Structures are given as C-alpha cells and as structure tokens.
C-alpha cells in the first residue's frame, strides 16, 4: 500500500495472507474469507503454481512476523480459477481457494459479505484497500497490514485514464486524481472493502494498474458484484 497507515489488530478480519512454500516460504498475495472453507483472491496470483500443496493461508494476522514454523495455517484443497481468465488486464481475475479445514469464526477471523444483486445500483463512499505490499514501486513486503481509503471512480472516468485498454463492467476502479494513496506490489488478490449501512462488502479484488499511486492512474479491481453467480456456482455446487 502507498500512503497508508498501520491497521489496528482485528480491523480487516476477512484479510488473509496467502503464502507459497516453493522454493522458500514467502507471502504471495492477499485474499478474503467469504465462507468457512472459501478464500476469494486474484487468478493472476497462481501464475506457475502447479499444485495447491505449496499454498498456506494465514488468517487473524496483523504482522508478517507472527508467521513462524509453529504458526497454524489453512491448507488448500483446491485452486479454482475462472475458466475465462487469460490475464489481469483482460479481466476474470478471480479465484477461489477451497480450504482443507474449516475456519473457526471469531473476532480475529471472520467473513466479509459479498455485494447483493440490488447493491449493483448503490454508490459506496467508504472504500478501503488493504495489504502487506510495497509502499513504493521498488520496495519490499511490509510487516504490518496497511490500509488506505480510496474513492471509487466511474468506468467512463477509468477508461479515459487507460488509453489502449478495455475497462469492462466486470472491472471497478479506484483512485485519487492526484494519486498518492493506492495498492502496490504484494497487495493483489486482497480486498477493496466498502462499508454501507454499517456493513462491510467485498466490492473488489486488487487486480492491476500502471505503477502505484500515480496521478490519473486509478487502481483496477475485479468487480465482485459481477461474479456473485460464479462464486455461488463454484461454492454451492450440489
């Protein structure tokens, strides 16, 4: 995150750190708990990941330093990538991780609500991007979960800012016209959480952008509302 502040423990209890084990253990991407055995993240996170066996999901974490060999995690049973996914910039940058065990809900780890079909119309004035990613384009993963409040931008406004790209209605953009506050390397897969009627909703999944926090370059997120049917399809299968 660029231009953000340390989060307070228990602030984003749906936020997880998705780690890889091969070659060595390291943070890979962000993600969100949406069900007791379901993580919603970005499809681009699994580039070259040939097995879910190398994945570890850590919930209830503020500081990466809390993660050691003795730290409990959730193993990944299955990686479900949207079958229309080619790349982040073309969209369908959405993936589900089915966990081997059930997440026990509490004040440190709980699910974020998905946007409702009626919520396709609503505005959202309280949106926040979270993560352990870089604070500037060339940097390193941060120990403490950072947060930044970001204003939503119209698809029309986002399209002017991305000449040579196609900003679809399955994408949602966020950013300040002057930049300064944004997501950056290591935040992707993570949430864009918006509060509406005292309830937090997973409006977006951190997907792509040109650099980080640059002026007239909004962050591009997967518009979760447009994938509610697909999430229900893959998680509610008979």
């Amino acid at each position: 995150i660029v231009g953000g502040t340390a989060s307070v423990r228990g602030e984003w209890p749906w936020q997880v750190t998705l780690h890889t084990t091969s070659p060595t253990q390291r943070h890979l991407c962000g993600g969100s708990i949406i069900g007791n055995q379901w993580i919603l993240t970005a499809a681009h996170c699994f580039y070259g990941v040939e097995s879910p066996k190398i994945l570890r999901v850590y919930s209830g974490i503020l500081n990466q330093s809390e993660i050691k060999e003795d730290t409990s995690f959730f193993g990944v049973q299955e990686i479900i990538i949207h079958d229309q996914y080619k790349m982040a910039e073309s969209g369908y940058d959405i993936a589900l991780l089915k966990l081997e065990t059930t997440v026990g809900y509490g004040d440190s780890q709980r699910p974020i609500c998905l946007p409702s079909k009626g919520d396709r119309n609503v505005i959202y004035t309280d949106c926040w991007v979270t993560g352990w990613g870089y604070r500037k384009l060339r940097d390193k993963i941060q120990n403490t979960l950072q947060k930044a409040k970001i204003p939503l931008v119209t698809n029309e406004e986002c399209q002017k800012r991305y000449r040579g790209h196609k900003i679809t209605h399955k994408m949602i953009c966020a950013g300040y016209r002057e930049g300064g506050k944004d997501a950056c390397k290591g935040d992707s897969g993570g949430p864009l959480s918006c509060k509406h009627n005292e309830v937090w909703h997973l409006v977006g999944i951190t997907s792509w952008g040109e650099g980080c926090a640059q002026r007239e370059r909004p962050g591009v997120y997967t518009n979760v509302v447009e994938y509610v049917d697909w999430i229900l399809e893959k998680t509610q299968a008979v």
């Binding site: 949406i34 069900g35 007791n36 379901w38 059930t102 699910p111 609500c113 998905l114 946007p115 409702s116 919520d119 309830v199 509610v228 999430i231 229900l232 998680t235 509610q236």
Partner: peptide
C-alpha cells in the same frame, strides 16, 4: 449476512 454461502 445478505448473500449466503453454505457451511
């Protein structure tokens, strides 16, 4: 919660 995912 508004949208329900089976446990």
């Amino acid at each position: 919660c508004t949208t329900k995912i089976k446990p």
